[PDB]
């Protein structure tokens, strides 16, 4: 209900750390076959 | 469905869902999914 | 629980008629080394999920990995084995003898980094990857883009390799490899497909290979090494970029000063985001490694660990940006011009009031409205918030185009 | 790890924000066998009294048979007590 | 019943299919925390309502069920210093007339005894495997401000931050936020220790506005303490609601400390640097202060009583006391609810609340103005540069006229209802008479 | 900003991983084909 305002941080960084990792690396399953 | 524990269980005492959904969630046992959390999720969209 | 015992107390698979939780298939020849993808849980070393009792099922990932720690490293050069052997048998309402399995698991988990971390040692081994990348090895560097400079900086291929493979010889036996010979892991490597595998020459030339055996394979594997091999190279091209303009800055070592105050500008900016980039977060990270991995001892965990501190390390490094920051790489289309452009120009000024100045006004608002917005674009954060921070902190220029 | 197939497909095949946080609702943890089934509820099958001899001979059969599938179903047999809310639109599916 | 008697109470489980039993289990069970924790347990004290007297009782069907949350679910959430898995020394079942009725109970009886040694053995895990009380202390600490230190540096840095304007809510920004709280805590001198980590912020309806003065007097800047889950048994939702608005309230109250030291900063702002020349509206208006500084510093001396000692002192031997987690939950609930109702924050004395909020907005409003302003008109023995001086006067005489007026309130409620902290407030505020 | 729009935008990067989720589902059904 309320909001702490810190737990943000600590989600920026998972989503950071999951959403970059897996966008450039799944595009690049492609590269190491088709390459 | 296409399966003894999967098809014949779906429509035993009243029975009657999608059966895609209804063979995704014959599969979601064996998935090892806590029974309430999946229900819930559904339950709270549909 | 006598075939249990065997596997967890020694690196022996009994299998009696395959209905034992674990068992081994020659998979091994698939990603024999290194966790290319993932073999020693579900595919060279399997887990039959049902074939396991419920008190065990509790920890069987444990059970399945105990044995490979004792049956990793005796293929290795270290007799990998646990002296403790508690039988196990069945007893009313009981299952202390189930609750072995955790001192076995990190016994086990003991041996095994008993040798990683002091033999094949990982704790000064891996050192050698960020010594290398990221110019760290600053003393091979500085040597390395400087004797064989001239044909290494030019700007479409035009490199020539066997110089600095001779080069990489003497500046590495100049440089402090002289400290531990670990040269041999170092191999060259070059782009199949420019940026994206990485998770012009001079401008970024090249990056390094890094393959190893068995046990420090389970650090070093596909998914890590592709951040190695081509890493980097998104660094390498600032240090040649700025060298490149301080090489025009040679060739004059009236004379209108807002052009030379420009080229003195437009460098601080190369120079001090390439202080953010590494020489920000170092020692942490290393104290964190060290403690995370020494004290957990266990494969589940420890590439975990490894794993995380790879990004944390990283993550200084602008080279890794969901954004790309992409008007930093337009910005540099620029930048390269400042070098060769006006290299050009210390010759055709008697061959810097007049044709340097007619791009000083172009230069100097081409790189001060990017750059004061790109930071604003990038305001996520709450050793970190480092390159907002300190390119904030200059208090003119602190921003022109604002996140708020 | 495979949540492609039975999370977010199974998530997307819904004919209905939690687009996305449902999977997150329903994050299973392969690792787990922790079914909340208990004896009481085996007398779900007796309020579908159109045939109770084959509506509770069914469970003996599925228990003999050998999948260990049959125990998370204490919530399945009840499924939803809106009327007709998933049963329904398999008929109008058929069209 | 003996056998399940035993299930509930030497083991956790309750083998039942029938409902033979009126225990329960629900998918609360599987993760278990929180309320979850709450709603797991028996259908009522009976079977709907009635009983087998000779061995459930309808009495100490209670006091069972509570060692069977000590047996069952401390160990569920993580293996346990009397239980391991559940490999402490195995469970056994314990369990014409000339005592017909008389001594039935007396056969069973013996479990309660059991039972007030698990209880017993209920007490240390909270003592220890989570220092509970101490980090009470350090809640104390931190959320109830008694690490001034910490406390000061915080209220020093927001409020600094809040007195250099920022009006349009432009001050409440997550960054700005975080790094005030961050290095208040890093500046705070006892250390983040353990105890001392697990805080975060937080505000409702985050202000886009400020009133002058900026006092964000509907008080939207907040503390929490992150809570654990073993923790998370005895730290409770309306627990850390109630001490939240007390820090929300006392933090407040900082802000008029903090005034205090502004409306004090505003005369070595200046310095009087005019050495040679002694002024009347200097005597006056550093004396109009006097009264306002000393009045809400012996409103904070009186609820720094009412609740740091007036009721924590109490409670430092209540929770000795006990031995029950159901009465350790039930006296760190009556703890805070007497907090609020001596700290004035209750509903019941929020009539003299008002009056408070009525001084508070008065020094705010009138003295932002004479930060705003220099020293008077000149002439005689003078200061000089603010026209307003007279409005500087009457607005203290409005302050004076809310302080007659809390005088004539404040007896009502000792005269009609009966509480002790208000005679001890207007025994003290106007000390030696009616009205000074 | 109200205290939305950021958390909007932490949706936006949770609908980011299910499209990542999605590009898995599509590229571990064409691993079948070819390879």
Known sequence: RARNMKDFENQITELKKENFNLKLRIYFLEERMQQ | ???????????????????????????????NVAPLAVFQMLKSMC | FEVLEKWIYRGIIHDPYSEFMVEEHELRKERIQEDYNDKYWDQRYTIVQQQIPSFLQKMADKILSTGK????????????????????????????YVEQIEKAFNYASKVLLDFLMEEKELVAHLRSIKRYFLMDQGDFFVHFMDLAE??????????????????????????????????????????????????LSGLEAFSFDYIVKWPLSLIINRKALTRYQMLFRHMFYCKHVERQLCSVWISNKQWFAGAFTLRQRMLNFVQNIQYYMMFEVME??????????????????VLGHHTGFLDTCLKDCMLTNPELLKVFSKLMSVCVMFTNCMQKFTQSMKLLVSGFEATINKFDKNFSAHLLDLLARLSIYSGMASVISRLDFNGFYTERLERL | ???????????????????????LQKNRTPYVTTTVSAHSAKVKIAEFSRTPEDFLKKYDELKSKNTRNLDPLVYLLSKLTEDKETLQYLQQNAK | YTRFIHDWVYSGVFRDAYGEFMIQ???????????????????????????CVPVFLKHIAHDIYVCGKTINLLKLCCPRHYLCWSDVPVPRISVLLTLPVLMKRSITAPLAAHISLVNKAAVDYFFVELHLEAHYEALRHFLLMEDGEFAQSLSDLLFEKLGAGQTPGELLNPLVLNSVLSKALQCSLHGDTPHASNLSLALKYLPEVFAPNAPDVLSCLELRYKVDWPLNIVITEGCVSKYSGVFSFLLQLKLMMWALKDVCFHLKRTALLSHMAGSVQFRQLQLFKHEMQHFVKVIQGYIANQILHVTWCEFRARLATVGDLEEIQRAHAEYLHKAV???????????VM???????????????????????????????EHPNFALMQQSYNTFKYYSHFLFKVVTKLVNRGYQPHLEDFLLRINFNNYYQ
């Open chain 3, 284 to 301: 942490p990270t290393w104290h964190i490694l060290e403690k995370n991995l020494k004290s957990a001892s266990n494969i589940d965990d």
């Open chain 3, 150 to 199: 001239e044909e290494l900086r030019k700007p479409v291929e035009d490199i020539t390799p066997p110089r600095l493979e001779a080069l990489l010889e003497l500046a590495l036996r100049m440089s402090t490899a002289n400290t531990d010979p670990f040269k041999d892991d170092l191999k060259i490597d070059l782009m199949p497909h420019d940026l994206i595998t990485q998770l």
């Open chain 3, 69 to 96: 720690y004792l049956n990793v490293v005796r293929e290795c050069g270290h007799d990998v084995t646990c002296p403790v052997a508690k039988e196990i048998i069945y007893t009313l309402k009981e299952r202390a």
């Open chain 5, 25 to 51: 289990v629900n998918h609360e069970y599987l993760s278990f925390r929180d309320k979850l924790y709450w709603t797991h347990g028996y259908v009522l004290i009976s079977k709907e309502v009635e009983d």
């Open chain 5, 354 to 384: 008002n009056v408070i909020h009525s001084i508070f907005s008065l020094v705010l409003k009138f003295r932002s103005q004479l930060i705003s302003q220099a020293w008077g008109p000149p002439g005689g023995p003078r200061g000089a």
């Open chain 2, 1 to 31: 469905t296409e399966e003894m524990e999967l098809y014949e269980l779906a429509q035993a005492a009243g029975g009657g869902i999608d059966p895609d959904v209804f063979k995704i969630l014959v599969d979601l046992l064996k998935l």
């Open chain 4, 1 to 23: 790890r495979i949540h492609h197939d039975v999370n977010e497909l199974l998530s997307l095949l819904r004919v209905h924000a939690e687009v996305y946080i449902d999977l």
């Open chain 5, 341 to 351: 109702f001596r700290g004035l924050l209750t509903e019941k004395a929020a009539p």
